[PDB]
UniProtKB/Swiss-Prot annotation:
GO molecular function: DNA binding; DNA-binding transcription factor activity
Record keywords: DNA-binding, Transcription, Transcription regulation
Stored Pfam families: MarR (PF01047)
GO biological process: response to stress
Protein name per UniProt: Uncharacterized HTH-type transcriptional regulator SAR2349
SUPFAM superfamilies found in the cross-reference section: Winged helix' DNA-binding domain
Domain (HTH marR-type) ranges: 8-144
Coiled coil: none
PANTHER family given in the database record: TRANSCRIPTIONAL REGULATOR, MARR FAMILY (PTHR33164), TRANSCRIPTIONAL REGULATORY PROTEIN (PTHR33164:SF44)
């Protein structure tokens, strides 16, 4: 439900990494479900974890989602006691956001499970550390272009 909720050489090349996304999320889905959190929620949670104290404004910008989407997901994170909002009289979109203790516990647990699952996947392949850094090198080049464009 989580993965479901979330929804030429150059051609074979792009296909090789774009088609891995969905299978990847299906496999990591249970990690989030076990913590009663959905993928959209996890991404914003993680984002806050790494940038807190942060704001709906900054979040929307780094995540590249629309305010309505970010507002709705944050609202669920708050309602679930995973993040706390600075109490202020300013606009909600300007208020500082940080993880609650429950939020941190959930975060550390998901993060470690994901890390171990990734290690496992790799361990079943013939991929070398070198092959991994070379891939990283190529992907970041692609990523630079897609972002500078936007
Ligand atoms: O950046 C993503 O789109 C993403 C999606 C699901 C899980 C981890 C991720 O980084
Ligand atoms: O970083 C990921 O690839 C990831 C995947 C599934 C759930 C949480 C995550 O951070
Ligand atoms: O990637 C995100 O930060 C995200 C968050 C909520 C809903 C959809 C999304 O892609
Ligand atoms: O509902 C809130 O308290 C809230 C707080 C910060 C950002 C968006 C929000 O909906």
């Amino acid at each position: 439900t989580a993965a479901a909720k979330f929804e030429m050489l150059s051609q074979e090349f792009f296909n090789s990494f774009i088609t891995i996304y969905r299978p990847y999320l299906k496999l990591t889905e249970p990690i989030l479900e076990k913590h009663n959190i959905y993928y959209g929620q996890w991404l914003i949670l993680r984002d806050i974890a790494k940038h807190q104290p942060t704001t709906l404004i900054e979040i929307s910008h780094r995540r590249a989602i629309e305010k309505p989407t970010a507002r709705k997901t944050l609202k669920a994170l708050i309602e679930n006691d995973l993040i706390t909002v600075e109490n202020s009289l300013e606009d909600k979109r300007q208020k500082f956001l940080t993880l609650t203790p429950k939020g941190h516990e959930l975060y550390e647990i998901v993060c470690l499970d994901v890390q171990k699952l990734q290690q496992a996947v790799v361990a079943k392949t013939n991929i070398s550390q070198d092959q991994m850094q070379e891939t990283i090198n190529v992907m970041n080049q692609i990523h630079e272009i897609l972002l500078k464009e936007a």
